[PDB]
Amino acid sequence: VWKEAKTTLFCASDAKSYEREVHNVWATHACVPTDPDPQELVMANVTENFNMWKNDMVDQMHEDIISLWDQSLKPCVKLTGGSTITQACPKVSFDPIPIHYCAPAGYAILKCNNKTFSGKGPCSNVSTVQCTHGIRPVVSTQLLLNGSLAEEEIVIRSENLTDNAKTIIVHLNKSVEIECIRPGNGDIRKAYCKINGSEWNETLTKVSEKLKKTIRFAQHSGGDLEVTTHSFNCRGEFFYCNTSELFNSSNITLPCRIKQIINMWQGVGRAMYAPPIRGEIKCTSNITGILLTRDGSTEEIFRPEGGNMRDNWRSELYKYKVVEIK
């Protein structure tokens, strides 16, 4: 007998007590080494009701990473509301690392073995673990990076498809590489997003299938820049790649443009960071997940959305839930 209770979690990662990475410095300040000998137990004939949207593990990690950025990525001017603060703004290395989240002394986590889990509901094959797997803190909009591929057919997940206002998260059964560069030699704020087109006319051809009326794709309706485009951080620079060519009626490239005036995803307010450093700034990370929205005719319209950042973690913590072992 058990019960779905909530408590204070803790992180576990292959942190390093020397490196100058933003993560590898904080992820060793309030985090622990990854437990070398894992222990999973395959529960037979066991079913449990998971949920990713009303989950707390999401809100746990979401808050822990906001703290990370509010004490690492220091903006030259942090502006929120009336009051204002302006401090130092140096450039540091920036590459996300595996952050296993583990359960404290007295509790446990359940890892749904069922690969085709709908994100919210019963799990046919349930197992249990002590900690999560290698989870890289990917902060972005429209697209998800460096994540984990879906083992089975393309999986869709929603909180309430009754409402078209609730975001939709997608996983994939094969990865597609993205390449956003910044030539190391005029105009600094300019970038190029490269994608193998042949591996794209497949990985979206397959998507609209599981999506099955008729399917139509378009660019974001209209919101803040960070949402209506692809916002992500590369070595410390906030890239913004125009996703217009992807959603039209090979070797697909995109006109990305580095900014400094970002609209903070943490809460409210904007921030200005120091201009990009000279040199080829090309971050290469895999594509694993997608965030969209539904428009509320014979067609159904789907627009990419960055909305709340909590979904970006909800795509990696969906098959987990906290329980107090009786």
PDB file of C-alpha atoms in Angstrom, residues 8-305:
ATOM      1  CA  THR A   8      11.361  18.088  -1.103  1.00  0.00           C
ATOM      2  CA  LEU A   9      13.475  16.437  -3.800  1.00  0.00           C
ATOM      3  CA  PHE A  10      17.170  16.776  -4.638  1.00  0.00           C
ATOM      4  CA  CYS A  11      19.363  16.696  -7.740  1.00  0.00           C
ATOM      5  CA  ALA A  12      22.046  14.204  -8.758  1.00  0.00           C
ATOM      6  CA  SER A  13      24.539  14.753 -11.575  1.00  0.00           C
ATOM      7  CA  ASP A  14      28.028  13.985 -12.877  1.00  0.00           C
ATOM      8  CA  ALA A  15      29.136  17.401 -11.648  1.00  0.00           C
ATOM      9  CA  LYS A  16      32.767  18.483 -11.632  1.00  0.00           C
ATOM     10  CA  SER A  17      34.541  20.368  -8.851  1.00  0.00           C
ATOM     11  CA  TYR A  18      36.741  22.371 -11.223  1.00  0.00           C
ATOM     12  CA  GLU A  19      34.993  23.189 -14.503  1.00  0.00           C
ATOM     13  CA  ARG A  20      33.746  26.703 -15.262  1.00  0.00           C
ATOM     14  CA  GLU A  21      30.499  25.655 -16.930  1.00  0.00           C
ATOM     15  CA  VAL A  22      27.422  27.447 -15.600  1.00  0.00           C
ATOM     16  CA  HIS A  23      25.737  24.138 -14.832  1.00  0.00           C
ATOM     17  CA  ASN A  24      28.859  22.280 -13.658  1.00  0.00           C
ATOM     18  CA  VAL A  25      29.326  24.941 -10.970  1.00  0.00           C
ATOM     19  CA  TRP A  26      25.790  25.173  -9.592  1.00  0.00           C
ATOM     20  CA  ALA A  27      25.112  21.461 -10.105  1.00  0.00           C
ATOM     21  CA  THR A  28      27.853  20.771  -7.559  1.00  0.00           C
ATOM     22  CA  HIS A  29      26.898  23.530  -5.133  1.00  0.00           C
ATOM     23  CA  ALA A  30      23.518  22.096  -4.134  1.00  0.00           C
ATOM     24  CA  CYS A  31      23.642  18.784  -5.982  1.00  0.00           C
ATOM     25  CA  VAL A  32      25.128  15.310  -5.512  1.00  0.00           C
ATOM     26  CA  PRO A  33      27.153  12.794  -7.574  1.00  0.00           C
ATOM     27  CA  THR A  34      25.056  10.386  -9.658  1.00  0.00           C
ATOM     28  CA  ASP A  35      24.533   7.069  -7.875  1.00  0.00           C
ATOM     29  CA  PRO A  36      26.682   4.572  -9.838  1.00  0.00           C
ATOM     30  CA  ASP A  37      24.651   1.416  -9.137  1.00  0.00           C
ATOM     31  CA  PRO A  38      20.998   2.087 -10.059  1.00  0.00           C
ATOM     32  CA  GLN A  39      18.136  -0.120  -8.877  1.00  0.00           C
ATOM     33  CA  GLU A  40      14.859  -0.560 -10.753  1.00  0.00           C
ATOM     34  CA  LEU A  41      12.083  -3.011  -9.879  1.00  0.00           C
ATOM     35  CA  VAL A  42       9.688  -4.255 -12.563  1.00  0.00           C
ATOM     36  CA  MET A  43       6.272  -4.366 -10.898  1.00  0.00           C
ATOM     37  CA  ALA A  44       4.135  -7.085 -12.488  1.00  0.00           C
ATOM     38  CA  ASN A  45       0.355  -6.752 -12.948  1.00  0.00           C
ATOM     39  CA  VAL A  46       0.525  -3.285 -11.377  1.00  0.00           C
ATOM     40  CA  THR A  47      -1.324  -0.203 -12.601  1.00  0.00           C
ATOM     41  CA  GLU A  48      -1.123   3.391 -11.360  1.00  0.00           C
ATOM     42  CA  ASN A  49      -2.604   6.752 -12.346  1.00  0.00           C
ATOM     43  CA  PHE A  50       0.186   9.116 -13.379  1.00  0.00           C
ATOM     44  CA  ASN A  51      -0.214  12.749 -14.394  1.00  0.00           C
ATOM     45  CA  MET A  52       2.252  15.222 -15.885  1.00  0.00           C
ATOM     46  CA  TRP A  53       0.149  18.391 -15.763  1.00  0.00           C
ATOM     47  CA  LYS A  54      -0.969  18.267 -12.135  1.00  0.00           C
ATOM     48  CA  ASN A  55       2.467  16.890 -11.254  1.00  0.00           C
ATOM     49  CA  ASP A  56       4.717  18.588  -8.700  1.00  0.00           C
ATOM     50  CA  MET A  57       8.059  17.222  -9.918  1.00  0.00           C
ATOM     51  CA  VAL A  58       7.743  19.664 -12.804  1.00  0.00           C
ATOM     52  CA  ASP A  59       7.253  22.637 -10.478  1.00  0.00           C
ATOM     53  CA  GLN A  60      10.137  21.324  -8.366  1.00  0.00           C
ATOM     54  CA  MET A  61      12.723  21.328 -11.155  1.00  0.00           C
ATOM     55  CA  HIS A  62      11.212  24.432 -12.777  1.00  0.00           C
ATOM     56  CA  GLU A  63      11.895  26.495  -9.650  1.00  0.00           C
ATOM     57  CA  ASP A  64      15.359  24.989  -9.126  1.00  0.00           C
ATOM     58  CA  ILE A  65      16.492  26.095 -12.594  1.00  0.00           C
ATOM     59  CA  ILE A  66      15.034  29.601 -12.360  1.00  0.00           C
ATOM     60  CA  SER A  67      17.308  30.013  -9.347  1.00  0.00           C
ATOM     61  CA  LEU A  68      20.224  28.766 -11.455  1.00  0.00           C
ATOM     62  CA  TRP A  69      19.789  31.476 -14.092  1.00  0.00           C
ATOM     63  CA  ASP A  70      19.049  34.247 -11.592  1.00  0.00           C
ATOM     64  CA  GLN A  71      22.493  33.669 -10.078  1.00  0.00           C
ATOM     65  CA  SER A  72      24.590  32.674 -13.089  1.00  0.00           C
ATOM     66  CA  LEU A  73      23.409  34.401 -16.263  1.00  0.00           C
ATOM     67  CA  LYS A  74      23.772  37.911 -14.857  1.00  0.00           C
ATOM     68  CA  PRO A  75      22.189  40.506 -17.169  1.00  0.00           C
ATOM     69  CA  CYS A  76      23.917  43.878 -17.533  1.00  0.00           C
ATOM     70  CA  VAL A  77      20.523  45.301 -16.592  1.00  0.00           C
ATOM     71  CA  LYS A  78      17.780  43.295 -14.895  1.00  0.00           C
ATOM     72  CA  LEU A  79      14.587  45.306 -15.321  1.00  0.00           C
ATOM     73  CA  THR A  80      11.289  44.281 -13.726  1.00  0.00           C
ATOM     74  CA  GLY A  81       8.413  46.613 -12.865  1.00  0.00           C
ATOM     75  CA  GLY A  82       9.280  49.990 -11.383  1.00  0.00           C
ATOM     76  CA  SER A  83      12.485  49.196  -9.498  1.00  0.00           C
ATOM     77  CA  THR A  84      15.627  48.535 -11.537  1.00  0.00           C
ATOM     78  CA  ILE A  85      19.010  46.859 -11.030  1.00  0.00           C
ATOM     79  CA  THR A  86      22.084  46.849 -13.263  1.00  0.00           C
ATOM     80  CA  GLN A  87      25.122  44.659 -12.569  1.00  0.00           C
ATOM     81  CA  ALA A  88      28.021  42.851 -14.265  1.00  0.00           C
ATOM     82  CA  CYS A  89      27.483  40.780 -17.407  1.00  0.00           C
ATOM     83  CA  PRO A  90      30.414  38.473 -18.277  1.00  0.00           C
ATOM     84  CA  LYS A  91      30.267  35.649 -20.833  1.00  0.00           C
ATOM     85  CA  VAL A  92      30.693  32.042 -19.722  1.00  0.00           C
ATOM     86  CA  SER A  93      30.525  28.607 -21.360  1.00  0.00           C
ATOM     87  CA  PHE A  94      26.964  27.279 -21.591  1.00  0.00           C
ATOM     88  CA  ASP A  95      26.048  23.662 -22.346  1.00  0.00           C
ATOM     89  CA  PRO A  96      23.275  21.712 -20.534  1.00  0.00           C
ATOM     90  CA  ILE A  97      24.212  18.541 -18.637  1.00  0.00           C
ATOM     91  CA  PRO A  98      22.375  15.444 -17.329  1.00  0.00           C
ATOM     92  CA  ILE A  99      20.542  16.305 -14.102  1.00  0.00           C
ATOM     93  CA  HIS A 100      19.082  13.182 -12.489  1.00  0.00           C
ATOM     94  CA  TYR A 101      16.381  14.045  -9.951  1.00  0.00           C
ATOM     95  CA  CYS A 102      16.190  11.622  -7.033  1.00  0.00           C
ATOM     96  CA  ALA A 103      13.848  10.765  -4.163  1.00  0.00           C
ATOM     97  CA  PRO A 104      14.822  11.441  -0.516  1.00  0.00           C
ATOM     98  CA  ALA A 105      14.971   9.011   2.405  1.00  0.00           C
ATOM     99  CA  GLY A 106      11.513   7.508   2.862  1.00  0.00           C
ATOM    100  CA  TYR A 107       9.949   8.005  -0.562  1.00  0.00           C
ATOM    101  CA  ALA A 108      10.085   6.576  -4.087  1.00  0.00           C
ATOM    102  CA  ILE A 109       9.436   7.330  -7.760  1.00  0.00           C
ATOM    103  CA  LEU A 110       7.545   5.327 -10.388  1.00  0.00           C
ATOM    104  CA  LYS A 111       8.915   5.025 -13.924  1.00  0.00           C
ATOM    105  CA  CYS A 112       6.119   3.935 -16.276  1.00  0.00           C
ATOM    106  CA  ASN A 113       7.649   1.259 -18.528  1.00  0.00           C
ATOM    107  CA  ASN A 114       4.805   1.608 -21.024  1.00  0.00           C
ATOM    108  CA  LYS A 115       6.391   3.468 -23.929  1.00  0.00           C
ATOM    109  CA  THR A 116       3.072   4.598 -25.405  1.00  0.00           C
ATOM    110  CA  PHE A 117       1.935   6.376 -22.247  1.00  0.00           C
ATOM    111  CA  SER A 118      -0.567   9.161 -22.933  1.00  0.00           C
ATOM    112  CA  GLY A 119       1.058  11.352 -20.282  1.00  0.00           C
ATOM    113  CA  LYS A 120      -1.973  11.303 -18.001  1.00  0.00           C
ATOM    114  CA  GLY A 121      -3.740   8.148 -16.843  1.00  0.00           C
ATOM    115  CA  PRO A 122      -3.150   4.440 -16.084  1.00  0.00           C
ATOM    116  CA  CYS A 123       0.196   2.732 -16.653  1.00  0.00           C
ATOM    117  CA  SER A 124       0.065  -0.901 -17.764  1.00  0.00           C
ATOM    118  CA  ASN A 125       3.686  -1.791 -17.009  1.00  0.00           C
ATOM    119  CA  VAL A 126       4.826   0.110 -13.926  1.00  0.00           C
ATOM    120  CA  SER A 127       8.288   0.004 -12.376  1.00  0.00           C
ATOM    121  CA  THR A 128      10.062   1.941  -9.639  1.00  0.00           C
ATOM    122  CA  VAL A 129      13.398   3.727  -9.340  1.00  0.00           C
ATOM    123  CA  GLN A 130      15.326   5.894  -6.890  1.00  0.00           C
ATOM    124  CA  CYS A 131      16.233   8.714  -9.281  1.00  0.00           C
ATOM    125  CA  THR A 132      15.377   9.930 -12.772  1.00  0.00           C
ATOM    126  CA  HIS A 133      17.589   9.504 -15.831  1.00  0.00           C
ATOM    127  CA  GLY A 134      19.983  11.916 -17.530  1.00  0.00           C
ATOM    128  CA  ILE A 135      17.918  15.078 -17.887  1.00  0.00           C
ATOM    129  CA  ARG A 136      19.497  18.095 -19.578  1.00  0.00           C
ATOM    130  CA  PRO A 137      17.957  21.485 -18.624  1.00  0.00           C
ATOM    131  CA  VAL A 138      16.858  22.548 -22.102  1.00  0.00           C
ATOM    132  CA  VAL A 139      15.416  26.055 -22.043  1.00  0.00           C
ATOM    133  CA  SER A 140      13.699  26.889 -25.335  1.00  0.00           C
ATOM    134  CA  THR A 141      10.462  27.632 -27.200  1.00  0.00           C
ATOM    135  CA  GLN A 142       8.667  25.952 -30.125  1.00  0.00           C
ATOM    136  CA  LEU A 143      11.283  23.166 -30.205  1.00  0.00           C
ATOM    137  CA  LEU A 144      12.860  20.894 -27.599  1.00  0.00           C
ATOM    138  CA  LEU A 145      16.573  20.092 -27.732  1.00  0.00           C
ATOM    139  CA  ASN A 146      19.036  17.516 -26.325  1.00  0.00           C
ATOM    140  CA  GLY A 147      16.155  15.479 -24.894  1.00  0.00           C
ATOM    141  CA  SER A 148      15.355  11.778 -25.084  1.00  0.00           C
ATOM    142  CA  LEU A 149      13.715  10.223 -28.145  1.00  0.00           C
ATOM    143  CA  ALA A 150      10.446   8.331 -27.836  1.00  0.00           C
ATOM    144  CA  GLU A 151      11.012   4.582 -28.083  1.00  0.00           C
ATOM    145  CA  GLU A 152       7.668   3.874 -29.756  1.00  0.00           C
ATOM    146  CA  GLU A 153       5.481   5.586 -32.346  1.00  0.00           C
ATOM    147  CA  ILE A 154       5.195   9.383 -32.115  1.00  0.00           C
ATOM    148  CA  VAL A 155       3.463  10.210 -28.821  1.00  0.00           C
ATOM    149  CA  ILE A 156       1.129  13.145 -28.195  1.00  0.00           C
ATOM    150  CA  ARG A 157       0.175  14.529 -24.774  1.00  0.00           C
ATOM    151  CA  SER A 158      -2.326  17.139 -23.573  1.00  0.00           C
ATOM    152  CA  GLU A 159      -3.893  18.230 -20.277  1.00  0.00           C
ATOM    153  CA  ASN A 160      -7.363  18.827 -21.668  1.00  0.00           C
ATOM    154  CA  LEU A 161      -7.909  18.585 -25.426  1.00  0.00           C
ATOM    155  CA  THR A 162     -11.390  19.909 -24.687  1.00  0.00           C
ATOM    156  CA  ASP A 163      -9.587  23.234 -24.391  1.00  0.00           C
ATOM    157  CA  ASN A 164      -7.515  24.283 -27.391  1.00  0.00           C
ATOM    158  CA  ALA A 165      -5.790  26.731 -25.046  1.00  0.00           C
ATOM    159  CA  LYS A 166      -3.832  23.961 -23.315  1.00  0.00           C
ATOM    160  CA  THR A 167      -0.403  23.300 -24.841  1.00  0.00           C
ATOM    161  CA  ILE A 168       0.453  20.102 -26.735  1.00  0.00           C
ATOM    162  CA  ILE A 169       3.790  18.297 -26.337  1.00  0.00           C
ATOM    163  CA  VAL A 170       5.189  15.820 -28.883  1.00  0.00           C
ATOM    164  CA  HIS A 171       7.924  13.154 -28.881  1.00  0.00           C
ATOM    165  CA  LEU A 172       9.729  11.426 -31.769  1.00  0.00           C
ATOM    166  CA  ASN A 173      10.965   7.941 -32.686  1.00  0.00           C
ATOM    167  CA  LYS A 174      14.004   9.373 -34.493  1.00  0.00           C
ATOM    168  CA  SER A 175      16.169  12.460 -33.963  1.00  0.00           C
ATOM    169  CA  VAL A 176      16.926  15.287 -36.396  1.00  0.00           C
ATOM    170  CA  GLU A 177      20.066  17.421 -36.082  1.00  0.00           C
ATOM    171  CA  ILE A 178      19.998  21.225 -35.969  1.00  0.00           C
ATOM    172  CA  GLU A 179      22.976  23.515 -36.611  1.00  0.00           C
ATOM    173  CA  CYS A 180      22.884  27.174 -35.592  1.00  0.00           C
ATOM    174  CA  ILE A 181      26.156  28.917 -36.413  1.00  0.00           C
ATOM    175  CA  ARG A 182      27.642  32.392 -36.055  1.00  0.00           C
ATOM    176  CA  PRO A 183      30.573  32.969 -38.484  1.00  0.00           C
ATOM    177  CA  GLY A 184      33.781  33.857 -36.645  1.00  0.00           C
ATOM    178  CA  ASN A 185      34.513  36.879 -38.828  1.00  0.00           C
ATOM    179  CA  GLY A 186      30.354  43.673 -40.222  1.00  0.00           C
ATOM    180  CA  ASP A 187      27.160  42.299 -38.702  1.00  0.00           C
ATOM    181  CA  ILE A 188      27.573  40.347 -35.467  1.00  0.00           C
ATOM    182  CA  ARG A 189      23.915  39.581 -34.779  1.00  0.00           C
ATOM    183  CA  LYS A 190      23.351  37.056 -37.568  1.00  0.00           C
ATOM    184  CA  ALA A 191      23.065  33.266 -37.607  1.00  0.00           C
ATOM    185  CA  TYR A 192      22.146  30.245 -39.741  1.00  0.00           C
ATOM    186  CA  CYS A 193      20.005  27.270 -38.679  1.00  0.00           C
ATOM    187  CA  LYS A 194      20.760  24.190 -40.795  1.00  0.00           C
ATOM    188  CA  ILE A 195      18.635  21.052 -41.018  1.00  0.00           C
ATOM    189  CA  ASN A 196      18.816  17.960 -43.219  1.00  0.00           C
ATOM    190  CA  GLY A 197      15.638  18.361 -45.266  1.00  0.00           C
ATOM    191  CA  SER A 198      15.260  14.716 -46.278  1.00  0.00           C
ATOM    192  CA  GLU A 199      15.141  13.784 -42.595  1.00  0.00           C
ATOM    193  CA  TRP A 200      12.511  16.496 -42.155  1.00  0.00           C
ATOM    194  CA  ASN A 201      10.048  15.611 -44.925  1.00  0.00           C
ATOM    195  CA  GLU A 202       9.800  12.320 -43.039  1.00  0.00           C
ATOM    196  CA  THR A 203       9.773  13.411 -39.398  1.00  0.00           C
ATOM    197  CA  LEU A 204       6.768  15.642 -40.052  1.00  0.00           C
ATOM    198  CA  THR A 205       5.165  13.381 -42.633  1.00  0.00           C
ATOM    199  CA  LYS A 206       4.895  10.846 -39.812  1.00  0.00           C
ATOM    200  CA  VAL A 207       3.620  13.399 -37.284  1.00  0.00           C
ATOM    201  CA  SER A 208       0.366  14.355 -39.029  1.00  0.00           C
ATOM    202  CA  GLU A 209      -0.422  10.631 -39.210  1.00  0.00           C
ATOM    203  CA  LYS A 210      -0.695  10.041 -35.478  1.00  0.00           C
ATOM    204  CA  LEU A 211      -2.379  13.448 -35.428  1.00  0.00           C
ATOM    205  CA  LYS A 212      -5.252  11.786 -37.285  1.00  0.00           C
ATOM    206  CA  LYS A 213      -9.864  15.342 -40.451  1.00  0.00           C
ATOM    207  CA  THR A 214      -7.264  17.420 -42.270  1.00  0.00           C
ATOM    208  CA  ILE A 215      -4.077  18.961 -40.874  1.00  0.00           C
ATOM    209  CA  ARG A 216      -2.700  22.460 -41.475  1.00  0.00           C
ATOM    210  CA  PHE A 217       0.515  24.000 -40.127  1.00  0.00           C
ATOM    211  CA  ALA A 218       1.352  27.690 -39.705  1.00  0.00           C
ATOM    212  CA  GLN A 219       3.600  30.114 -37.817  1.00  0.00           C
ATOM    213  CA  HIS A 220       2.670  31.458 -34.372  1.00  0.00           C
ATOM    214  CA  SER A 221      -0.413  33.702 -34.333  1.00  0.00           C
ATOM    215  CA  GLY A 222       1.283  36.602 -32.573  1.00  0.00           C
ATOM    216  CA  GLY A 223       2.973  37.014 -29.211  1.00  0.00           C
ATOM    217  CA  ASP A 224       6.298  38.120 -27.765  1.00  0.00           C
ATOM    218  CA  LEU A 225       9.324  37.585 -30.007  1.00  0.00           C
ATOM    219  CA  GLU A 226      10.705  34.751 -27.868  1.00  0.00           C
ATOM    220  CA  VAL A 227       7.480  32.802 -28.486  1.00  0.00           C
ATOM    221  CA  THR A 228       6.690  33.501 -32.145  1.00  0.00           C
ATOM    222  CA  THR A 229      10.228  32.381 -33.008  1.00  0.00           C
ATOM    223  CA  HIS A 230      12.717  29.800 -31.727  1.00  0.00           C
ATOM    224  CA  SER A 231      14.371  31.183 -28.592  1.00  0.00           C
ATOM    225  CA  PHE A 232      17.391  29.355 -27.201  1.00  0.00           C
ATOM    226  CA  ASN A 233      20.781  29.994 -25.622  1.00  0.00           C
ATOM    227  CA  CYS A 234      24.023  29.071 -27.375  1.00  0.00           C
ATOM    228  CA  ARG A 235      27.267  29.465 -25.381  1.00  0.00           C
ATOM    229  CA  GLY A 236      25.590  32.404 -23.631  1.00  0.00           C
ATOM    230  CA  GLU A 237      23.986  34.114 -26.624  1.00  0.00           C
ATOM    231  CA  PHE A 238      20.210  34.264 -27.061  1.00  0.00           C
ATOM    232  CA  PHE A 239      19.418  33.023 -30.572  1.00  0.00           C
ATOM    233  CA  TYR A 240      16.173  33.726 -32.414  1.00  0.00           C
ATOM    234  CA  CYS A 241      15.620  31.618 -35.533  1.00  0.00           C
ATOM    235  CA  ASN A 242      12.744  32.533 -37.848  1.00  0.00           C
ATOM    236  CA  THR A 243      10.605  29.409 -38.270  1.00  0.00           C
ATOM    237  CA  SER A 244       8.643  30.373 -41.383  1.00  0.00           C
ATOM    238  CA  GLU A 245      10.101  28.140 -44.092  1.00  0.00           C
ATOM    239  CA  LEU A 246       9.365  24.955 -42.137  1.00  0.00           C
ATOM    240  CA  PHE A 247       5.622  25.626 -42.111  1.00  0.00           C
ATOM    241  CA  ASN A 248       4.717  26.283 -45.748  1.00  0.00           C
ATOM    242  CA  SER A 249       2.112  24.894 -48.147  1.00  0.00           C
ATOM    243  CA  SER A 250      15.960  19.758 -48.649  1.00  0.00           C
ATOM    244  CA  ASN A 251      18.893  21.569 -47.010  1.00  0.00           C
ATOM    245  CA  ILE A 252      16.430  23.858 -45.232  1.00  0.00           C
ATOM    246  CA  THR A 253      18.231  26.795 -43.625  1.00  0.00           C
ATOM    247  CA  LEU A 254      16.872  29.518 -41.335  1.00  0.00           C
ATOM    248  CA  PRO A 255      17.720  33.215 -40.767  1.00  0.00           C
ATOM    249  CA  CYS A 256      18.584  33.329 -37.054  1.00  0.00           C
ATOM    250  CA  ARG A 257      19.552  36.599 -35.382  1.00  0.00           C
ATOM    251  CA  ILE A 258      21.234  36.992 -31.989  1.00  0.00           C
ATOM    252  CA  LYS A 259      19.578  39.435 -29.591  1.00  0.00           C
ATOM    253  CA  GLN A 260      20.444  40.978 -26.235  1.00  0.00           C
ATOM    254  CA  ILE A 261      17.042  42.348 -25.246  1.00  0.00           C
ATOM    255  CA  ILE A 262      15.250  39.218 -24.062  1.00  0.00           C
ATOM    256  CA  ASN A 263      11.829  39.026 -22.446  1.00  0.00           C
ATOM    257  CA  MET A 264      12.481  36.915 -19.340  1.00  0.00           C
ATOM    258  CA  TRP A 265      10.839  33.485 -19.239  1.00  0.00           C
ATOM    259  CA  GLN A 266      11.134  33.356 -15.447  1.00  0.00           C
ATOM    260  CA  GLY A 267       8.377  35.908 -14.917  1.00  0.00           C
ATOM    261  CA  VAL A 268       7.960  39.546 -15.914  1.00  0.00           C
ATOM    262  CA  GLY A 269      10.604  41.960 -17.174  1.00  0.00           C
ATOM    263  CA  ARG A 270      13.313  42.270 -19.807  1.00  0.00           C
ATOM    264  CA  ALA A 271      17.092  41.968 -19.610  1.00  0.00           C
ATOM    265  CA  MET A 272      20.057  43.120 -21.685  1.00  0.00           C
ATOM    266  CA  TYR A 273      23.213  41.010 -21.864  1.00  0.00           C
ATOM    267  CA  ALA A 274      26.698  41.866 -23.128  1.00  0.00           C
ATOM    268  CA  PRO A 275      27.123  41.609 -26.940  1.00  0.00           C
ATOM    269  CA  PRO A 276      28.317  38.278 -28.457  1.00  0.00           C
ATOM    270  CA  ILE A 277      31.992  37.326 -28.337  1.00  0.00           C
ATOM    271  CA  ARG A 278      33.991  37.072 -31.560  1.00  0.00           C
ATOM    272  CA  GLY A 279      34.371  33.554 -32.931  1.00  0.00           C
ATOM    273  CA  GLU A 280      32.330  30.774 -34.505  1.00  0.00           C
ATOM    274  CA  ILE A 281      29.373  30.312 -32.164  1.00  0.00           C
ATOM    275  CA  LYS A 282      27.809  27.081 -33.419  1.00  0.00           C
ATOM    276  CA  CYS A 283      25.863  25.058 -30.871  1.00  0.00           C
ATOM    277  CA  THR A 284      24.831  21.651 -32.114  1.00  0.00           C
ATOM    278  CA  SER A 285      22.024  19.937 -30.205  1.00  0.00           C
ATOM    279  CA  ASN A 286      19.547  17.197 -31.169  1.00  0.00           C
ATOM    280  CA  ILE A 287      15.841  17.804 -31.762  1.00  0.00           C
ATOM    281  CA  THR A 288      13.608  15.590 -29.625  1.00  0.00           C
ATOM    282  CA  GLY A 289      10.365  17.395 -28.814  1.00  0.00           C
ATOM    283  CA  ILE A 290       7.888  19.964 -30.114  1.00  0.00           C
ATOM    284  CA  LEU A 291       5.416  22.364 -28.470  1.00  0.00           C
ATOM    285  CA  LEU A 292       2.302  23.673 -30.255  1.00  0.00           C
ATOM    286  CA  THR A 293      -1.265  24.952 -29.856  1.00  0.00           C
ATOM    287  CA  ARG A 294      -4.689  24.386 -31.426  1.00  0.00           C
ATOM    288  CA  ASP A 295      -6.901  27.035 -33.032  1.00  0.00           C
ATOM    289  CA  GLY A 296     -10.376  27.249 -31.523  1.00  0.00           C
ATOM    290  CA  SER A 297     -14.127  24.204 -41.316  1.00  0.00           C
ATOM    291  CA  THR A 298     -12.631  21.011 -42.735  1.00  0.00           C
ATOM    292  CA  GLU A 299      -9.117  21.732 -41.463  1.00  0.00           C
ATOM    293  CA  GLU A 300      -7.423  21.928 -38.072  1.00  0.00           C
ATOM    294  CA  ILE A 301      -4.790  24.594 -37.468  1.00  0.00           C
ATOM    295  CA  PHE A 302      -1.702  23.993 -35.328  1.00  0.00           C
ATOM    296  CA  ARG A 303       0.668  26.775 -34.235  1.00  0.00           C
ATOM    297  CA  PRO A 304       4.033  26.275 -32.466  1.00  0.00           C
ATOM    298  CA  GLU A 305       4.107  27.844 -28.999  1.00  0.00           C
TER     299      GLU A 305
END
